[PDB]
Structure formats: C-alpha cells, structure tokens
Design a protein around this ligand. Sequence first.
Ligand code: TSX
Ligand code: MN
Length: 603
Amino acid sequence: NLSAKVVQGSLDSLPQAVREFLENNAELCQPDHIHICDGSEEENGRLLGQMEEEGILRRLKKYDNCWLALTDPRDVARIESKTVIVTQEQRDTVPIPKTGLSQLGRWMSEEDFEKAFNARFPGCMKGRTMYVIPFSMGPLGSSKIGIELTDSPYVVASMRIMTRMGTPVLEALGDGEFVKCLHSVGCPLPLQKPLVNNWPCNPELTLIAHLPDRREIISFGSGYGGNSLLGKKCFALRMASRLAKEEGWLAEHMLVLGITNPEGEKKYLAAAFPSACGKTNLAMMNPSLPGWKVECVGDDIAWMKFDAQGHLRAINPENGFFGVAPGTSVKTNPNAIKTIQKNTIFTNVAETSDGGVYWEGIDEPLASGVTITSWKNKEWSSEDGEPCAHPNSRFCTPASQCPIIDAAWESPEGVPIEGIIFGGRRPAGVPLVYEALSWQHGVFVGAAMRSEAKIIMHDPFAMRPFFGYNFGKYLAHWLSMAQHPAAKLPKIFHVNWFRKDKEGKFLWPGFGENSRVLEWMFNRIDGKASTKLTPIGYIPKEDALNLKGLGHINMMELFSISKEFWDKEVEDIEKYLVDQVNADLPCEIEREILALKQRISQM
Ligand SMILES: C=CCn1c(=O)c2[nH]c(Cc3ccc(NC(C)=O)cc3)nc2n(CCCC)c1=O
Ligand SMILES: [Mn+2]
C-alpha cells in the first residue's frame, strides 16, 4: 500500500513514531508520492533541478549555485490575522484585554480548529509529493528535533539551509519525541484556481496553527518562509517560548553576537528588535573602531538557559540566515554580502540581465547595457514608481558561510550572555542608548518597546507576533529570573539608531559606528563609572561615548530627554499594558510604571 508511493528512502528505516505520523497524514492528505528527505547535496541538486523545470526557481548564473523564487504577490509575508494558538482556555494563550481585541496573539478554540482543519487538509496533497523533513533546531546532538511534512520542494530546500536536515537527524532522533509539523500549500491537482509565477498558495484559507499540548504545528495555504519553515517562528519562538516557561529557560526573538575589545576581552550580547531596525545588519556588523572585533552567532532566534554558575547561555537554534534583502549592500552589511555569494536561495528580489540579483539600496551601479527584471517578472526602470524588489524579499543563506561566524556558534554549551539589548525605530524623543536601572526595570523596558512601521506600534520584546502563551505570564517568567539561585543577570540596554532632527535627518550615522555604542555597553558591563542618571535609566556621561573619527554629532539632541515627550510616553505605556495585559500584568511591572511617572514628575 503506502510503500508503493515511496520514491526515496524506506518506511522500515523510520522510527515507529515517525512512520505513524507519516502514515496518518498521508492517508489524510492523499499525496501521490512520499519522499523521505536525506539532506544530501545530491538530493538538493535534484530538487533544485526539478524546481527549475517547473518554473518555481530560476538559476542566478552570476553566482555559484544561487537561485531565485518569485511568489504569488498574495503570499509574501506572514499573516498575523491567520496565525493562531489552540488551547482549552483562552487565558493560557493571550490575556483578556480591558478593551478592544488582544494585540498579544490570537487564540482559536479546539472545536473551531478541528472545524478549520477538516475544511482544509483532507485530499490537499493530491497530485503532489509529500516530503518528509527530519530537522534539528540547534546543533546535531542535545537541541530539539521535528518532522515536517510538506508538499513544497521550496520548503525542503530552505529547510536544508535554515535547519540541520536529513538522515543524520533521524539517526540522532531514534525513538525520541519530535515536534509534529504539517504544511500544505493547499492546491491539490488538478488545480482549481490559477497558478501565479508557478507558486501555489491558498491565501483565502491560509492558517498557521500551533497546538502546544499535542506538540503539533499545522500550516495551510502559504509557502512564505515565516509561514512554511515550521522550525523557525512557529517552533523555535512560539512553541518553544511555552516549553521554556515550563522548564525555566527562555526562547527569544534575539540576534546573538560576540564582541571583542582591542585587549582580547570578549562578551556575547543578545538583541531583540522589531522589523525594519536592521537586526541582521547588527548581527554581522563590521565595526568601525580600530582593534574591535564582532562575530555573529545568530540573527533571529536565541534559546537561553542558566548554566550551573548562573550564566544565561544562548544557542542559535537555526542553521542559517533568512535575511531581509532590500537595504543590503557592501556599505550597510559587508558580511551579509560575502555570505550570500553562493549556495543561497533568494525570494522576490529583482534579477539583472547577467543573472545577478538586485534590490533597493543594493548600491551597485549596473554595467553598460545590463537591465533589471522586477520581482513581478517585468522589465523595470527607476521611473516605474514601484520597487524592483518586494520590501519583504529575502535571502536564505547558510550560516557557516558568514565570514565572521562565531567559533562557538554551534557549541552545545552555548555562549554566555552578558548583556541584553532592546530597541526600536523612534524618530523622536528616545535617546541613542540607555541602560536599565535594575532587572525589574529592564523587563519593563522590554515590555514598553514601541517602533515605527507611518505608524508607531507596540512590540514588547519584539515578540508581539510570536508569544506562545499569555504575555502577562511571559512577563512574570522574565521577572522570575532575578530569583534564580546565584543568577548572573545580563545588563539590559535600550537603543535607537533612528532618531531624527526636525528636518527628518538621522542624528546617528549607525551601521559600523554602532560599535561605539557597543563599546559603551561593553565597559558598563565591566563596571566602568561611565553613567549619568536620567528618569529613563542611565545614559553615557558627557564625553564618555567614543566619537573619534566621526564628523559632527549633535550629542545634545541625540541624548535629549524631554518632560513633555516622556509624559506622553509613560501615559501611552501604562495605557497599553494595563489594557492589554489586564489581570495578568505582574505587580512588579505596575511598580515600574509608577516609578517612571514618579521620576518624570520630578523633572
Ligand atoms: C548595524 C547596523 C544597523 N542599522 C543602523 O544603524 C541604521 N541607521 C539607519 C539610519 C541611517 C540611514 C542612512 C544613513 N546614511 C548616511 C549616509 O548617513 C545614516 C543613518 N538605518 C540603519 N539601518 C537600516 C535599517 C533598515 C533595514 C541599520 O540596519
Ligand atoms: Mn524575525
């Protein structure tokens, strides 16, 4: 029966639990074939070739083994609306707000989800191959393993880069447990609807669901990576944050980097930023300060767990970078540019006529007669009034290829976090850098995060779309870390690269010069008496920030804290947290809200 549909591998060499998961979902989805992924170069070559034949990928001949996927324009981003967590009780998933609808996640009842599942999954893979992806989140060797079933070869190839994938994962798994991951593009053959750019999706029925009690992730109708690469946001943030809450650790939307001063002293820092803040540019930043070194552990997700000496240790559970393409250049991110030179999948970027990539802000003058095809497969000029690349277009690239990849990026011990950075995009009022007054205040600073998307929105811990459970409880869990025995708590900082003058010009040059801010953090961690007290925390004392080699910087306006601005700010923060977190807001946070208005009242 089922064996006859297998086109690669053998049912018999799957652990019983993997086999049963496959059997149940094959019976349900009715795929024409089953391909058990081995994760070999040869398999990758084959799937890339097949995808080229079918129009899903084009070859980018300018480079060594680079490819380009163009999507249906309806399927270009994750949809928060259609992203749900399923629990017996709503409160376990999101706080019940005081007014309005929750902005802290989306809950669906078990009953509603069973209905939603039956209207989508039966027969969904008809005419397609079901791929079986064994993957490890974190280095191969305890780490969490999952099995993703998908009808998308694009997902297979992306998973190979973004996770450890294939036969060795099944070998490490044995009869262990795994997260069950089910994905379909939702377009059974014969196609009932038009195919755009050979890219199957079902936007109307798109649903990305998490069932934490069953250890199941179920995703329908979208091929876009945030929705389809189930190890990443779905597992390593949402489900894991839940597990972490239970087991006394932390799963966070954080880059991790290692920074070394000119005397050879090295610290690791984790940072959470909302979108459009240049996460990845900071993760592999090339520092301008002489003698300094920055190395990249990860640009997206961090798993953090206290060791026996109370140090918070971080592992990057990913195997790659799924980076925003537009804005990437030799100037803004020289390390990303070298990373993506080979073995990289690009999605929704433009293509030059010599088979190179192009996007807004690539800052690379075209040769004579070279022209650009846009991401909607049209000839493109700068007079079109339309970007050549989609704003959310991506590169998907092996982490091992980053020239400053950290030597301990795959250490199963993890790397000791000495500082946590929170930040946002704030055109007014928020200084370039400040330090939390205490752990409790640092939790509040994370909880208070807002960022410009032209709208300024709340995005606490940069986790707004990613909480796996009640944010009030997530806040209590963060607070609880100050009572871990002998905890060596990271110093907490808040940054803003994006403060502007009245004409909208950026006050801080940023990029490589951000090394000057990390320098201040670095020395503060080491106890340097370099702080000046303000109502919002510590800022750099006068002349403490290293400005050697820069043009003029308006330091006064950059570090300016206005009573009027901060009155408006704390009112907005209180309002947001009391309303949205309501009965689940920990009283330590209530105290921090009051303490801040009290400090502001005194100015
Ligand atoms: C480690 C670097 C992080 N970083 C920054 O530090 C940063 N700072 C800015 C604002 C800025 C933009 C352009 C200039 N250019 C010139 C010439 O002054 C200066 C500041 N944009 C920044 N960006 C781009 C974010 C959008 C994807 C950014 O990524
Ligand atoms: Mn992210």
